[PDB]
Amino acid sequence: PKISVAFIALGNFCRSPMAEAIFKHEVEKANLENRFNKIDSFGTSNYHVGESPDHRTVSICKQHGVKINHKGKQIKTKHFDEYDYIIGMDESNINNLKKIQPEGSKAKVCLFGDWNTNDGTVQTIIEDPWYGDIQDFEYNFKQITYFSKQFLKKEL
Template identity: 50%
Template sequence: MSTTIDLYHPSHDEQISVLFCCLGNICRSPMAEAAFRDTVEKLGYADRFSRIDSCGTAGYHVGAEPDHRTIEMLRKNGITTDHCARQVAQKDFKNFDYILAMDTSNLSNLKRIEPKSGKAKVMLFGYFDGNKRKEIVEDPYYGGNSGFTENFAQVVRFSKNFVREVLQVEIPE
């Protein structure tokens, strides 16, 4: 995939850190965090990541566990999570290599508060959609279970493409 974003490609002996971000940190981003962690473990690249976490741009649910539908979708796919919601902090821009937003609204919010001294590549997670469309991971909170099913399929696909592009490795389809 040709890129207009300058991706950070770590050397083979470097670890990288990834932070997933949505609005309240109870649906999409904790699902992405858990699915990403599971994906890199299954692909054999877990040792390439020093930290995988998630947060929200808003503090509505700080300290809460993920939405029960997120937990159920993860469980249905053999994945567990013990995440507690948190709000993005200024230090995240310095402590993470990538901050991946679920949608353009949260991306705008992240860009607005991003300090000039931050090192993180702040971008849409959907940049790694594999189709050059920059897909949005829609908020499923007010909908039915189908939104959570669609979100899960997206975050697994994006996770594989992220590993493929950032680590510059071959990943089986």
């Protein structure tokens, strides 16, 4: 039974759209598209609804040959029954999602870094790069790619 994954953070502008794009790219590279139904990204906030992702997230993806095309969208309560995994970037994301999640809904809310090996390659928390520089977006790329592979390796 295919699985559906939603990456959800705060603004659906920096990290979540990058995570959706990189994950799709790794799924394709691994030739496992058949195991998945939906792979999306949302934000708990409506601040960037309708907007294309941060130009720095777009640049970083393009620089790595990762396709990305998205418009900001806000989480909906039904998303907890729609997706098998609802993956946050940082702890504040989890706090908010856990407070919104209807009891008994199927979605397994978790931090992407939960798939970290803790082998020193990357840190567990995917920090919001918005107030930073392109190097923070670059490090996010590295973390998301790493957790993407770990996920495909552990969940399938």
